[PDB]
Coordinates of C-alpha atoms and ligand atoms in Angstrom, one line a residue:
Chain A
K1 CA -19.0 -41.6 40.8
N2 CA -17.5 -39.5 38.0
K3 CA -20.2 -40.9 36.1
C4 CA -23.1 -39.6 34.8
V5 CA -26.2 -40.7 36.8
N6 CA -30.2 -39.3 37.2
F7 CA -29.4 -39.5 41.0
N8 CA -32.2 -40.4 44.0
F9 CA -31.5 -39.4 48.0
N10 CA -34.1 -40.2 50.4
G11 CA -36.3 -38.8 47.5
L12 CA -33.6 -36.0 46.0
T13 CA -34.4 -36.8 42.5
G14 CA -31.7 -35.8 40.3
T15 CA -28.7 -35.7 37.1
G16 CA -25.5 -35.1 38.0
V17 CA -21.9 -36.6 38.7
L18 CA -21.5 -37.7 42.5
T19 CA -17.8 -36.8 43.6
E20 CA -16.2 -37.6 47.4
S21 CA -16.6 -34.4 48.5
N22 CA -13.3 -32.4 51.7
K23 CA -17.1 -30.6 53.0
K24 CA -16.3 -30.6 56.9
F25 CA -20.4 -31.3 56.7
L26 CA -21.1 -31.5 61.3
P27 CA -22.4 -34.8 62.3
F28 CA -25.7 -33.5 62.1
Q29 CA -26.9 -31.6 58.6
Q30 CA -27.6 -34.2 55.3
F31 CA -27.2 -31.5 52.2
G32 CA -25.6 -28.7 51.4
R33 CA -27.4 -25.9 49.1
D34 CA -25.5 -23.8 47.0
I35 CA -26.7 -19.8 46.2
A36 CA -29.3 -20.4 43.9
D37 CA -32.0 -22.8 47.0
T38 CA -30.0 -26.0 44.3
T39 CA -28.8 -28.6 46.2
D40 CA -24.7 -29.4 45.5
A41 CA -23.6 -32.0 48.3
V42 CA -25.5 -35.3 49.8
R43 CA -24.5 -36.9 52.9
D44 CA -25.6 -41.4 51.1
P45 CA -27.9 -43.2 54.0
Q46 CA -25.5 -46.4 54.1
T47 CA -23.0 -44.7 53.5
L48 CA -21.7 -41.6 55.5
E49 CA -19.4 -39.9 53.4
Chain B
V1 CA -11.9 -1.7 38.0
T2 CA -13.2 -5.0 40.3
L3 CA -14.4 -7.7 37.2
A4 CA -16.7 -10.7 37.7
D5 CA -15.2 -13.0 34.7
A6 CA -14.5 -12.0 31.8
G7 CA -15.8 -15.1 29.6
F8 CA -11.7 -16.0 30.7
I9 CA -11.8 -20.7 30.5
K10 CA -13.8 -22.1 32.4
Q11 CA -12.9 -26.2 32.6
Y12 CA -14.3 -27.7 35.3
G13 CA -11.3 -28.4 37.3
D14 CA -11.8 -25.3 38.8
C15 CA -15.3 -24.8 38.7
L16 CA -17.2 -28.1 40.3
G17 CA -16.0 -29.1 43.7
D18 CA -15.2 -26.3 46.7
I19 CA -15.5 -22.9 44.1
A20 CA -19.5 -24.0 43.1
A21 CA -20.0 -22.8 46.7
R22 CA -18.5 -19.0 46.0
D23 CA -17.6 -18.2 42.9
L24 CA -20.3 -16.1 41.3
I25 CA -19.6 -16.6 38.0
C26 CA -19.6 -21.1 38.4
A27 CA -23.1 -21.1 40.0
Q28 CA -24.5 -19.0 36.9
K29 CA -22.8 -21.5 35.0
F30 CA -24.5 -23.9 36.3
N31 CA -28.0 -23.0 35.7
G32 CA -27.3 -21.9 32.0
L33 CA -26.2 -18.4 32.4
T34 CA -23.0 -18.0 30.1
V35 CA -20.7 -14.7 30.2
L36 CA -19.6 -15.0 26.3
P37 CA -16.3 -13.7 26.2
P38 CA -15.8 -10.4 23.9
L39 CA -14.6 -10.4 20.2
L40 CA -11.2 -7.8 20.3
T41 CA -8.8 -8.4 23.0
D42 CA -7.2 -6.5 25.9
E43 CA -3.9 -6.3 24.0
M44 CA -6.3 -5.8 21.1
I45 CA -7.5 -2.8 22.4
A46 CA -3.9 -1.6 22.9
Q47 CA -2.3 -2.1 20.2
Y48 CA -5.3 0.1 18.7
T49 CA -4.4 2.1 21.4
Ligands
LIG101 C1 -26.9 -51.7 55.6 O1 -26.1 -53.2 55.7 C2 -25.5 -53.5 56.2 C3 -25.7 -54.9 56.7 O2 -26.0 -55.5 55.0 C4 -24.9 -53.3 57.7 O3 -23.9 -53.5 57.3 C5 -24.9 -51.7 57.5 O4 -24.8 -50.8 59.1 C6 -26.5 -50.9 57.0 N1 -26.4 -49.6 56.6 C7 -26.6 -48.4 57.9 C8 -26.4 -47.1 56.8 O5 -26.4 -48.6 58.8

């Protein structure tokens, strides 16, 4: 976290910084999408944060 | 007159995390669209006026 990386979650490849969100995802949700139809949040599958 | 931006210092302290979901300006910047600042300030115009 807080470092620049080539992430992949579940096949959602990309490049970015990752950080501990405060976004109150309801328990069924896994992604947030930005206005631009581009993912901006993900719930880690091994450790649900 | 109420403005979406004027080039007024975006430093990712605001634009990364919470506000990236709502501020039009953060989304533009994160997608490679930059508002540039005017050469004269709203003080410098007030001096000429
Ligand atoms: C991953 O494996 C460890 C044990 O090897 C376990 O603690 C953990 O629950 C596993 N991941 C998930 C999402 O259950």
